[PDB]
Amino acid sequence: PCSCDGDRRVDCSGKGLTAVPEGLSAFTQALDISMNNITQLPEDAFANFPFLEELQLAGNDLSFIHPKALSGLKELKVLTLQNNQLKTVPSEAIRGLSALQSLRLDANHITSVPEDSFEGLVQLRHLWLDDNSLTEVPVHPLSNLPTLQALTLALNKISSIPDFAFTNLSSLVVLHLHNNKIRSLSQHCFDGLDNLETLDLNYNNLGEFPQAIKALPSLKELGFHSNSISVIPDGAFDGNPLLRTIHLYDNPLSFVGNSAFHNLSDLHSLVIRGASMVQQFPNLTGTVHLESLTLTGTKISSIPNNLCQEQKMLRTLDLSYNNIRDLPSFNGCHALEEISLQRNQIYQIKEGTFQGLISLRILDLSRNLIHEIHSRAFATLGPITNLDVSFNELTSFPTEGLNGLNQLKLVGNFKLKEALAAKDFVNLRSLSVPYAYQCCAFAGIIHCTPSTGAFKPCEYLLGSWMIRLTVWFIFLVALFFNLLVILTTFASCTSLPSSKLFIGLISVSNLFMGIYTGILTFLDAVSWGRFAEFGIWWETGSGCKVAGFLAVFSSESAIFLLMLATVERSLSAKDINHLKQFRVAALLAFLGATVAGCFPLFHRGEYSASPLCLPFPGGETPSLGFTVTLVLLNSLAFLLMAVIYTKLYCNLEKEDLSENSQSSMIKHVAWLIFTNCIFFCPVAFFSFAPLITAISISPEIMKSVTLIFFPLPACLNPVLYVFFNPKFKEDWKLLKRRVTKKS
């Protein structure tokens, strides 16, 4: 059933045995039984084999052991019984084996240890007791063992350690007690453990720093974390000089002694986080083997200048969330690699601060108040790969010896507007720059976060030559025909009717829109091929604000004056005394256009979204601050006069419309309003586009029709008027008569 190794070794795995195997050679040396179904051990089960050395009973459910069953095994060395179903430590059947070496009792639900247990074992060296349900340390059975080396009691339910627990263990080397529920430690609990090297107390509920550790003279590695320790008194580590590793994290530490960490001749790393009230740098005299130093969350304001004159082998350095104001020189250091200084009050950089660090790779100085950086700062600094400096008021950024850089982030430095030289950064992989136009110099595989897409072009503002000539065309004739029509309507020395003065104001508003378009065309013509250079200055200056205000103002006056024109016509027909009434209404509407245009100016960043200074296209996120409001006002008005004119259609018949000159005026107004409706639908649709997730159009296209479909009325309204109202011809003859009389 079980194979024979030939060297006196017998192995049994999952062969369904409920009793001890028999018939094997009496000279076998090692016996393993695992995964079978033995539940009880009969008396004199192992009397057959007198030369057994190592004994494995793994995984089966043994529950009862006869006291005399284990007798006769005087040479047994290793005994393993884990994951079985014993409930108490077998004080009997164990006293016989004098020459036992290692004993493993894991995963067995054990609650009580008999007093006379572990008696007669004179040379036991390893004893494993974890994952059980122990509730108090077996002081007497432990004292019974004088030659124990390694002790593990983990995951048990111990609550407190009484005094003089481990007096008689002279040669104990390592002690593991983690995940227990210890909360109090006596001052003399650990006496006698002179040769203890490793001490583990993790995840316990310690509420105050223990003192008994000062009795240990040769404690190498010490680990406690996730506890509730909050205060580190000075002189704590005085007793034990040699400490390679100190584990502490997740503790809610508040105060740490000035001289606590002093005179540790062999400590390797030091980490302190969350210690808020500590405000003065620790005294590190005598510690000359510190690879890594980390202090976070404190109130430190200054740094000693002998720091790495002492620390000759420091490799990394991080100091963030402090109140550091000035930086002492780091010239002495040679092995320093990574430096992090964030959320501090640094405001200037000097040449000498970073001089002499040969092997510095990663440098971070983010979220500070630095505004002055010397040109020669970074000049003789060695090969540096990743440099991050952002969210600081910075005016000019030098570049000397940065050719080896790979990662460079500068975002939030709105004061920085100078372009970036492409030749210097030869091996740059990832950029972050505050304004998208700067990346146009690289024209990128370089990665620049800012989108620098169509809405923010590099070479031409208007893009296509056809679009350029088209806007040039409507600009011109809008201007010329608007001037002609206003001269015809106003220069005549005749009484001015309400409708005539109304169309005059229409002409004035359309003229304003036209020279807004003209100023845009002038900018495009001037900045041909090099828009990237001028973009930042143009958007930041007041010109963009002026242009946007002009456009917005021109577009509201036209709409409101048209609405007032068609109710003027409606009630004029109806009374067929409101002339002065409507004149000041027109004035009041002009004032409203003025204030509506100037309202966004007091806000921040509303007019700088696009180089065109028109907010209605918006962008990635215009987040409808007032765009939705404006389109709502425009649509509601249009539907109002749509209803008004439908009512007029119902009231007055078509034959009277054909035979009435006032109705010819009505037809002209109807043409005007219909044109205004269809030419304003597209911009409203574009503003509604981001609200719907399904619809998406390329910035190429939305820019083109936003450019084309905005100013058309300023062009066709005067053309419509002169082409289809002989009223203009009559005024033309009148002004010809006046000119002939003058000349």
Epitope: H126, W128, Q149, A154, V174, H176, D200, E221, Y249
Partner: nanobody
């Protein structure tokens, strides 16, 4: 004390592989073990580890299983659907103190190291 590993070799992409490590001794803490990956020209990195919620690396998430059997004191790591970037040398590391997940991205804490194996994926 002594650590030994078995497994490894050359496998076409998308295969499955099992790596088994055995340990002998008593000083090590059975609640801190890890598998470490090394590619030439770079320092060791921690692929996976057992802590007391196993710690898994960013990259190998969803394709790597780590298990421990204290019945026979063996550590198992099974991989499936490998990518060629997984071709490297593998180590088993055991500590002397209990450890958390935060201790696994720094190898210097671990002390007991194995001889290692080599696995290549095509």
């Amino acid at each position: 004390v002594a650590l030994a590993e078995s497994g490894g070799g050359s496998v076409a992409a998308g295969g499955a592989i099992r790596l088994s490590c055995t340990a002998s001794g008593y000083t090590y803490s059975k609640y801190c073990m890890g598998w470490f990956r090394q590619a030439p020209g770079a320092e060791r990195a921690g692929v996976s580890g057992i802590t007391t919620s196993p710690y898994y690396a960013d990259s190998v998430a969803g394709r790597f299983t780590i298990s421990r059997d204290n019945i026979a004191n063996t550590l198992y790591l099974q991989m499936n659907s490998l990518a060629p970037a997984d071709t490297a040398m593998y180590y088993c590391a055991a500590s002397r103190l209990s450890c958390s997940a935060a201790d696994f991205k720094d190898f210097r804490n671990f002390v007991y190291w194995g001889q290692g194996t080599q696995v290549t994926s095509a």
